[PDB]
Design a protein around this ligand. Sequence first.
Ligand SMILES: [Sm+3]
Ligand SMILES: [Sm+3]
Length: 280
Amino acid sequence: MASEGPALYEDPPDQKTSPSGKPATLKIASWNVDGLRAWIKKKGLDWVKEEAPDILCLQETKCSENKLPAELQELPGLSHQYWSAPSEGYSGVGLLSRQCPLKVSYGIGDEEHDQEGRVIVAEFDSFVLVTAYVPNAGRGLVRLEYRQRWDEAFRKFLKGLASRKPLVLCGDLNVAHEEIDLRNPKGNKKNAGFTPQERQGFGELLQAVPLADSFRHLYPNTPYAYTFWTYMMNARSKNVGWRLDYFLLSHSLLPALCDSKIRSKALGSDHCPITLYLAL
Ligand SMILES: [Sm+3]
Ligand SMILES: [Sm+3]
């Protein structure tokens, strides 16, 4: 039945200097934790402590802002913590930072799309950071029409932000852009995450803002690089996954891009974390 066996992928070593030789000054980690409490129970924070990022973005926290695990109070290097949950138990995002942002905002300015705690905007001196947990198209694509409306509203919102300050977007964008972004493109053409509607949406986001796919920019032809594997069917051991997590940057930030990583070995969720190195 299934045609996939193991496909090897070894993320290359961390490139910590930009094309001009400037060492990375900013390290950002993004991770769909599939439940903040479950993830922490699975020692997610031990990985964070070792990675020591300047900023940590989390998606799918599924946790009430008033029920945050006490273990989060043990992250000395990430004392500035912000969260956003649905207008409990689902969706939700978080953003933890070493340095205090100039301003933090929630949502994308559209009431219809701001009730499920999917976006946090943190403005810094030289750039604005947005982390998002994009709405899934759903089983049977029952939420694809809504997803298309979200895609348009999100694209417009981001273009607005980027028109004033360099932008960095990270998170679970719930879509594998190209065939190279998932192990089984032929069998998922009508499934959430790989529909023409979703893929065209991602392509338009890149063109309209405009934004560049950091990982693909550096590794244009590298296959089998995924960030999500279903917990079922022993998918992760066979590397039958999807690259749903990204770091999209304004073109003006490309000269500061050092590396965009996929931490394939970090356990604790059905998604692995991704890390960005910028020389700002
Ligand atoms: Sm999940
Ligand atoms: Sm293609």
